[PDB]
Amino acid sequence: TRPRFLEQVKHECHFFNGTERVRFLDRYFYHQEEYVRFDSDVGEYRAVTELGRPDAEYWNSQKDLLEQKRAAVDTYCRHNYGVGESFTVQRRVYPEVTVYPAKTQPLQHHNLLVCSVNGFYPGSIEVRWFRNGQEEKTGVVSTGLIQNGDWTFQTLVMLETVPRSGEVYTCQVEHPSLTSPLTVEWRAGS
Amino acid sequence: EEHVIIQAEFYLNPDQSGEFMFDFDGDEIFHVDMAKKETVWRLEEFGRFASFEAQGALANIAVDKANLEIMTKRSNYTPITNVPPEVTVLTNSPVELREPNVLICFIDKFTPPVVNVTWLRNGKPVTTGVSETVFLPREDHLFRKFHYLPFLPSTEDVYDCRVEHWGLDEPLLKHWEFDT
Amino acid sequence: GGIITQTPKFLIGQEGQKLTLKCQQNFNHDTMYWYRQDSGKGLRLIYYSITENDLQKGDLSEGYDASREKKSSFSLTVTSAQKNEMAVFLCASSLRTGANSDYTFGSGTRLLVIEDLNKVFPPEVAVFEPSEAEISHTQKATLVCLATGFFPDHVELSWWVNGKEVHSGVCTDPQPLKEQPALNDSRYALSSRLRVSATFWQNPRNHFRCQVQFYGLSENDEWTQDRAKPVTQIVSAEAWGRA
Amino acid sequence: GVYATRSSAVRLR
Amino acid sequence: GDSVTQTEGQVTVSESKSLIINCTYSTTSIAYPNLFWYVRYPGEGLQLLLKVITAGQKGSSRGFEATYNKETTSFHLQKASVQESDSAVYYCALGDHSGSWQLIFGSGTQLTVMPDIQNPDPAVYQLRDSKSSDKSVCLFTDFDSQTNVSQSKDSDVYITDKCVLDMRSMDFKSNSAVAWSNKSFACANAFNNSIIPEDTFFPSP
Ligand SMILES: *[C@@H]1O[C@H](CO)[C@@H](O[C@@H]2O[C@H](CO)[C@@H](O)[C@H](O)[C@H]2NC(C)=O)[C@H](O)[C@H]1NC(C)=O
Numbered sequence: 001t002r003p004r005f006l007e008q009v010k011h012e013c014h015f016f017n018g019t020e021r022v023r024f025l026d027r028y029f030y031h032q033e034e035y036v037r038f039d040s041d042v043g044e045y046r047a048v049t050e051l052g053r054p055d056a057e058y059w060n061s062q063k064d065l066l067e068q069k070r071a072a073v074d075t076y077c078r079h080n081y082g083v084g085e086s087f088t089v090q091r092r093v094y095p096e097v098t099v100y101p102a103k104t105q106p107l108q109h110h111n112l113l114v115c116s117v118n119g120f121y122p123g124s125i126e127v128r129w130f131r132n133g134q135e136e137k138t139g140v141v142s143t144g145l146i147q148n149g150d151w152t153f154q155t156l157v158m159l160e161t162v163p164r165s166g167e168v169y170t171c172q173v174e175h176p177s178l179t180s181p182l183t184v185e186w187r188a189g190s
Numbered sequence: 191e192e193h194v195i196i197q198a199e200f201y202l203n204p205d206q207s208g209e210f211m212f213d214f215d216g217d218e219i220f221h222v223d224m225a226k227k228e229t230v231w232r233l234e235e236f237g238r239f240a241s242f243e244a245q246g247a248l249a250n251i252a253v254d255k256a257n258l259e260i261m262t263k264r265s266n267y268t269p270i271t272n273v274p275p276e277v278t279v280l281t282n283s284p285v286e287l288r289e290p291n292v293l294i295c296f297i298d299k300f301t302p303p304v305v306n307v308t309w310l311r312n313g314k315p316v317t318t319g320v321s322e323t324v325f326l327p328r329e330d331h332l333f334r335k336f337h338y339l340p341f342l343p344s345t346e347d348v349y350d351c352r353v354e355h356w357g358l359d360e361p362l363l364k365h366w367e368f369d370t
Numbered sequence: 371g372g373i374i375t376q377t378p379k380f381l382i383g384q385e386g387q388k389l390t391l392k393c394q395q396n397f398n399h400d401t402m403y404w405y406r407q408d409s410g411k412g413l414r415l416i417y418y419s420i421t422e423n424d425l426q427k428g429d430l431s432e433g434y435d436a437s438r439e440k441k442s443s444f445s446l447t448v449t450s451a452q453k454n455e456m457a458v459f460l461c462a463s464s465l466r467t468g469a470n471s472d473y474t475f476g477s478g479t480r481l482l483v484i485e486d487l488n489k490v491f492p493p494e495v496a497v498f499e500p501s502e503a504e505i506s507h508t509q510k511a512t513l514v515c516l517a518t519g520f521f522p523d524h525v526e527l528s529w530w531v532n533g534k535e536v537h538s539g540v541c542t543d544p545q546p547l548k549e550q551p552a553l554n555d556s557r558y559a560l561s562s563r564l565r566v567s568a569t570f571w572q573n574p575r576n577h578f579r580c581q582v583q584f585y586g587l588s589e590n591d592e593w594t595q596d597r598a599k600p601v602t603q604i605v606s607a608e609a610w611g612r613a
Numbered sequence: 614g615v616y617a618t619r620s621s622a623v624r625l626r
Numbered sequence: 627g628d629s630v631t632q633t634e635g636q637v638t639v640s641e642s643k644s645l646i647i648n649c650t651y652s653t654t655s656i657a658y659p660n661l662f663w664y665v666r667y668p669g670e671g672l673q674l675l676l677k678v679i680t681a682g683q684k685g686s687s688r689g690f691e692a693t694y695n696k697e698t699t700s701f702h703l704q705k706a707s708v709q710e711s712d713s714a715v716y717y718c719a720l721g722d723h724s725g726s727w728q729l730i731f732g733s734g735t736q737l738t739v740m741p742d743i744q745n746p747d748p749a750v751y752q753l754r755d756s757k758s759s760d761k762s763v764c765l766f767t768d769f770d771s772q773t774n775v776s777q778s779k780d781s782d783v784y785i786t787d788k789c790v791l792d793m794r795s796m797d798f799k800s801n802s803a804v805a806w807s808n809k810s811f812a813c814a815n816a817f818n819n820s821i822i823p824e825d826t827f828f829p830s831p
Contacts, residue, residue, distance in 0.1 A: 002204055003269040004302045007258035008331060009250070011197040011619035018191045026622070030261045031270040032301055032331035038622075045622075051265060058625045059467075065622060068469040068725065071680050075658045075723045076617050080195055080212075083240050083614035088214045089193060098284050116284045122215070148282050148294060149323055149336035151217045151233060197619055212616065219616075239614060243655045246618035249726035253468060253621040256421075260624040374671075403728070411634075411733035413717070418728060427728070460671065468620040470660055470679070470725045475671030498763050501751035503829035514753050514763050514804055541791035541802060547784055561786050561804040563765070565793060609756040617657040618724040 006031055013077035022073040022081075028052065038069045045069075092177035093152060095120035099171050099186045101163075113159040113186060115171035119152045122176065127157040130170035136161070163188045198327040199247075201254040202302055203262070208254065209303070209324055210247035221324045222247040232323075273332060274357030275300035277364040285343050285368060293366060295337040295351035303333045306354035306361075311339075312347060343368060372397045376461040376476040380524040380585040382490070383483050385453045391446040391479055393461035399474065400466035402444035404436060407458040407478070419444055420466060451483045482522045487591070490600045491557055492584045493520035495607040500571055511571035513609065515580035518549065518559040524585035529564045532577050539565045571611050579608040628654050630732040632718045637735055640771065641710055641742045647703040647735050649692075649718035656727055661694050661701040662719040664731070672717060676703070679723060688712075708739045710790075740771035741790050741799045748773075748826035752813045764805040764813035766821075775803045775820045783807040783816060 008029035015022055026038035026045075035052030038045045038059075044066055045056040059065050081089070095117045102112040117127060123145050129136045139160035146154045159169065165188060173182040196213040211221035218232040222244045229242040262268075278296045285291055297305060303325035309316050319340045325333040337351065345368050353362045374395035383389045393402065401420040405413045406429060415428035417436040424436050433449040444461065461476035484490075496518075500511035517527065523546045529536050546558035562580065570576060586600040593599040632649040639645050653659055663676035678685040678694040678701070685692055689712075690705045703716060718732035747768040755761040766775070769788075777785035785805045792799050805816035814828050 003267075004205065004304075005203040005258060005262045005267075006270050006302050007201045007254050007261060008327075009199045009254055009257075009621045010327065013195040015191065015193045015195070026619070028257070028622075029331055030258075030265065031268070034331075035261070054264070055622070055624055059622050062467055062469070064471055065467045065469040067679065068620075068723070069622075071723070072619060074680055076619050077195070079617050079658055081193075083616050084195075084214065084219060084236075087236060087239050088219070089191060096283070100284065114284075118283050146280070147216055149217075149296075149326075152282075154282060199621070240616060241614070242616045243618075243657065246657075246722070246724050246726045249724070250618065250621045253623055257621065257624045260626065405731075413731040413734075415728060462672075466623055468622045468725055470662075470677075470721050470723075470729075472674040472677075473664070473672065473729065475666075475673065477669065477671050496761065497756045498753035498761075499756050501753050501765065501829070503831075504749070504751045504765075504767070507749065507827065507829070508747065508768065512751070512753070512765055512767060512802070514765060516763060516804075516806065538794040539791055539796075541789035543786045543789060543804075545787070547778070547786060549784070551781065559784060561763075563789065563791060563802055563804070565791050565800070565802075567796070607756070615655075615657040617722075618726065620724045620726060 008032070011072075011076075013073075013080065015077070015081060019078045019081055022077045024069070024072045024077050026069055026072075028055070040070070040073050043070055091121050091151065093119060093121040094175060094177040095125075095154075095173065095182075097171060097173050097182055097184045099169070099184045101186070102158075107163050107165055107188060107190065109162070111161060111163050113161060113163075113169055115157045115159070115173075115184070116154070117157070117173055118154045119148075120154075120175050120177060121152055123153050124176060125153075125155065126174040127155065128172040128174075129157065129159045130172060131161065132168055133170075165190055196327065199250055199254055200303065200325075201251060201258050202304070203255075203258060205302075205304065206255075207304075208251040210251060211324060211326075213327060218323065218326060224248070224251065270302055272355070272357035273299065273301045275305070275353060275355055275362070277351060277353050277362050279349075279351050279364045279366045287343050287345070287368075289343060291341060291343050293339040293341055293349055293351075295339075295353070295364070297335040297337070297353055299328070299330075299332050299334070300355055300357060301332050302356070304356070305335060306352075307335070307337045308352040308354075309337065309339045310350040310352055311341075313350075372474070374461060374463055374474055374476050376459070376479055378479065379477065380480050380522075381482075382522060382524070382586075383448075383451050383481065384487070385483060385485065386450050389448045389451055389481065391448075391459055391461075392443065393445070393476060394440075394443045395461075395463045395474070396442060397463055397465070397474060398441070399463035400441065401464055402438070403462040403464075403473070404444065404446045405460040405462065407460055409456055413460070417446060448481075451481070453483060454485065455481070455483050457481050480524060482524070484522075487587065487593075488595055489521055489555075490586050491519050491521050492586060492600050492603055493517040493525065493560075493582050493605050495580055495582050495605045497578065497580050497607040497609045499609055499612060500568075505568045505571075509568045510565055511568050512563055512565045513571075513578060513580075515562045515564070515607065516559065517561070517582045517605070519557045520546075520560075520582075520584060521557050522585075523558045523560070525560060526583045527560065527562050528581045528583070529562070530579040530581055531564075531566075536564070541565075572613055574611045574613055576611040577608065578610070579606055581606040627652055628656055628720075628730060630718050630720045630730055632716075632732040633735040634733065635736065637737050639708055639737070639739050641739055642707045645703075645705045645708045645712075645737070645739075647716055647737070648700070649702055649732060650698075650700045651718075651720045651730075652699070653720075656720070656722045658723040660721045660723055661692070662721065662729065663690070663692055663701075663703055664717040664719055666715040666717065666734070668714065675716070708737075710739055710741050713738045743770050743799070743801065746770035748822065750813050750817060750821075750826065750828060752831050762806070762813075764816045765802060766805065766817045767802040768800050769826075771801060773801070773820055775817070777803075777820075779819065782809050783811055785816065
């Protein structure tokens with residue numbers, strides 16, 4: 001029953017084209033609402049809501065504080081980018097792919113073909129489906145990217161189809177951790 | 191290339207609990223354990239390639255608590271409105287019998303960052319092999335969290351994720367079984 | 371008009387005594403520091419206090435204790451001056467902005483610890499009139515003042531011409547001289563010179579006075595010897611112009 | 614490699 | 627190990643001549659250091675002089691300059707033409723960009739810049755006491771700034787260090803050192819070591 005009070009501070013570094021263009025943001029929040037913000041383009045603090053005007057006027061009066069935040073694209077952003085570069089921006093983990101039908105049932109009945117892609121990093125991945133060698137872009141549904149919270153993603157790309165005898169459905173996965181595409185086939189059978 | 195590194199911090203009253211963590215493209219690099227005053231890396235291998243001085247994090251958490259007391263008064267003690275969480279339970283791999291798997295309980299879109307997550311195996315609380323994450327930040331400035339239960343897929347075993355939050359009138363129970 | 375002042379400028383103590391140093395500043399600086407500059411080298415932080423809560427760091431284990439009730443006052447005490455140490459204590463303050471704010475320092479407190487107060491002596495001052503040969507050779511006149519026999523070297527020398535302190539044409543030894551090589555005597559001497567034009571000195575109306583402020587005991591201290599108590603005092607010597 | 618810490622600007626008063 | 631080291635002791639340069647005060651730093655816990663120079667004039671407290679917070683950038687103040695050099699891990703203080711008002715103690719200090727680490731000061735280098743004496747006129751004089759005619763001191767005055775006034779070889783005679791006075795009204799400066807004794811000693815030879823007999827002037831007392 002005791003009322004709570006939350007302060008949040010988020011020092012954000014945004015990188016484009018590696019470190020060729022960097023933007024720094026010094027964001028101060030009260031109850032999930034941004035009150036005052038320093039941005040490496042404006043060069044000083046600004047108040048997003050009126051309730052953070054006193055802090056912006058105060059920090060903008062001190063050149064020592066401003067020269068500290070103006071420098072943070074170089075002494076903080078590009079610095080911490082280089083510290084973790086080898087195991088973050090260059091991290092490559094390949095996924096395990098598994099293809100399985102959603103229902104054990106006869107052919108010529110409607111079915112849903114699941115291509116499960118588990119454990120890749122980074123998130124950039126392309127997943128395709130092939131019916132007898134022809135890519136099929138209709139009837140595809142994806143869960144999107146699922147973060148497992150451990151520096152791996154997963155995703156399920158499902159295919160709606162009516163399976164027929166002799167059909168070979170192929171899931172194809174493309175990912176930076178792999179020099180060649182990953183393919184897993186499913187036999188329709190009888 | 192396009193990435194986002196975020197150094198995210200918070201302080202909560204009157205709970206007097208703080209958190210300091212780094213975030214890369216949505217993933218936690220490390221957090222500072224306020225109790226032990228030590229850097230805790232999300233993946234143990236990370237500490238072999240980099241280090242971090244926990245006392246600089248503690249400096250900021252002292253600043254944030256003074257910053258919060260000023261802002262609470264400035265707002266005439268405007269409290270935070272609780273937000274209940276969304277709970278989704280899943281596995282990190284397709285389920286096969288006698289093939290080891292991990293249950294993931296995903297708590298999302300909530301605030302303030304205080305929860306009670308309890309794994310249950312057939313109604314029985316399980317406290318062996320469980321692990322969890324700290325509160326991870328969101329771009330809408332809510333929080334998220336992961337809890338993990340490694341298990342052996344069975345036909346007679348049943349699991350539940352029990353999440354208690356102030357935004358909930360009743361403890362939220364999300365279910366899982368071998369037949370999803 | 372900001373200021374940061376520590377007291378006292380000079381402070382002699384005995385062993386085991388509890389010596390308190392006070393520092394106050396009117397900069398509205400949240401955090402204050404206490405450094406110790408020793409004879410050799412190195413500033414070493416003894417205590418710092420961010421806002422209203424200190425944090426022992428660097429040199430507490432030498433036996434110190436700080437206190438701070440007001441934002442403007444940072445007080446340092448030596449738990450037990452032990453023993454015969456010689457050290458300068460510097461007071462600093464800085465603004466708590468989250469950035470590296472510039473430090474503002476005080477002049478310093480010179481602390482000296484001795485076994486026997488019977489070693490403390492005020493100085494003897496003498497003024498020496500310019501040489502007749504210097505006047506004809508350079509058309510200028512050099513007065514020399516000599517302060518001898520004092521301990522400690524807690525002195526400030528000053529020249530006064532016709533009742534006003536002068537600065538131009540004055541030179542004082544940067545450091546005193548130990549008169550005797552003995553450790554258990556080691557009285558100091560210090561000299562200064564005031565050089566004026568030969569015409570200004572040859573005017574018998576111009577009055578010259580060398581003046582030496584000595585920092586010694588206080589009336590609060592105990593004295594058991596027969597000689598005069600070597601209290602804080604000025605000692606001075608004068609000379610009039612000469613035709 | 615040592616990670617840096619961006620400081621939080623202190624609120625006045 | 628998170629520390630600073632700079633030039634030990636004292637440095638003596640001539641007025642209007644180049645100066646270089648070395649400084650270097652090491653780091654273990656400080657992630658991104660900021661580098662500072664502090665000055666302490668005689669009879670004053672330390673104040674900030676220079677300050678650089680960014681890799682490879684140069685800071686300049688009062689004719690001094692220092693470059694935060696990460697390749698050499700240094701921050702040397704330089705000045706093309708020192709003035710006599712620059713005689714002070716200079717300290718090299720090290721912090722972190724966060725602002726959370728207390729400044730790490732160096733040992734401090736003492737700089738004394740001697741004035742440019744254009745017309746050296748070495749001479750030893752004998753001054754007598756205003757009270758009595760018995761006591762007397764010796765004055766070695768008007769010598770060149772390069773003269774190293776060596777002293778305190780004999781224990782019965784005392785010799786002070788060189789001193790430069792400024793007759794600001796007259797725009798004139800001159801060195802001086804004092805010698806005295808209690809034994810019945812001649813003023814001329816009191817500066818036996820730091821003297822050039824053929825050039826200095828010896829009056830007949
Ligand atoms: C998580 O559960 C604990 C324990 O039930 C809660 O902490 C308090 O615990 C005491 C018992 O020591 C109870 O008397 C209090 O009623 C509990 N507080 C509340 C608000 O229920 C803790 O609050 C729970 N956290 C959440 C987010 O529900």
